[PDB]
Amino acid sequence: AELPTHYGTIIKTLRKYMKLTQSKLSERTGFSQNTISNHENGNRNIGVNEIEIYGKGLGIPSYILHRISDEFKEKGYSPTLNDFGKFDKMYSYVNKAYYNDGDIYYSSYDLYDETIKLLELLKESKINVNDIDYDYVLKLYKQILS
């Protein structure tokens, strides 16, 4: 099957955020450089099973792409994509907590929703995501999962 064309835009936006050229993303997915260009522009369709390959190449689990797409479908843009730098920084701590803390591993529900909820808590507290550390995130994460 084929996906919405907007996955190409999502990949192009994320590729740029990751500071990867099309050539580097090719040497990270096995898609030719020209094929990456064609996916991004909508000249070729992206496979359902191809997003998995892109996620690995971008260093991102595929659900994040799927979650971003669902926002486009509802709102006509993605607030998460538009603020991805903050999402990525919070996600780094969420990912660490999930893979290193048994209480989080076995109590987490939806890691995407939890990353968004943690960002909302920081915004309420007027805290910059660049100023936090893992210990602090883990305290907030345990609280949202309580």
Numbering used by the authors: 8 to 153
Would you copy out the relevant sentences from the publication that reported this structure?
The Staphylococcus aureus pathogenicity islands (SaPIs) are the prototypical members of the phage-inducible chromosomal island (PICI) family of mobile genetic elements. Stl is a DNA-binding protein that binds to the intergenic promoter region between stl and str (the SaPI transcription rightward regulator), preventing transcription of the str and downstream genes, thus maintaining integration of the island in the host chromosome. The remarkable ability of the SaPIbov1 Stl to target unrelated but functionally similar antirepressor proteins relies on the modularity of this repressor. In this way, SaPIbov1 Stl presents three domains: one corresponds to an HTH N-terminal domain required to recognize and bind the divergent stl-str region present in the SaPI genome; a second (middle) domain responsible for interacting with the trimeric Duts, while the C-terminal part of the protein recognizes the dimeric Duts.
Therefore, we determined to solve the structure of BovI-Stl by eliminating this region and dividing the protein into two functional and complementary portions corresponding to the N-terminal (BovI-StlN-ter; residues 1–156) and to the C-terminal part of the protein (BovI-StlC-ter; residues 175–267). The crystal structure of BovI-StlN-ter was solved to 1.8 Å resolution and showed a single copy of the protein in the asymmetric unit that presents an α-helical folding, as was anticipated by in silico modelling, composed of 10 α-helices. The initial four α-helices (α1–α4) correspond to the DNA-binding domain, presenting the archetypical helix-turn-helix (HTH) motif observed in multiple repressors, as well other DNA-binding proteins. Helix α5 connects the HTH domain with the remaining five helices that form a more compact helical bundle. We named this portion of the protein the middle domain due to its localization in the Stl sequence. The structure shows that the N-terminal and middle domains are closely connected by helix α5, while an unstructured region of about 20–30 residues connects the middle and C-terminal domains. In the model, BovI-Stl recognizes the DNA by inserting helix α3 of the HTH motif into the major groove of DNA. Our model further proposes that additional residues such as Q29, S44, N48 and R22 could mediate the nonspecific read-out of the nucleotide sequence by interacting with the DNA backbone. The first three residues coordinate a sulfate ion in the BovI-StlN-ter structure that could mimic a DNA phosphate, since superimposition with the C.Esp1396I-DNA complex places this sulfate at the position of a DNA backbone phosphate.
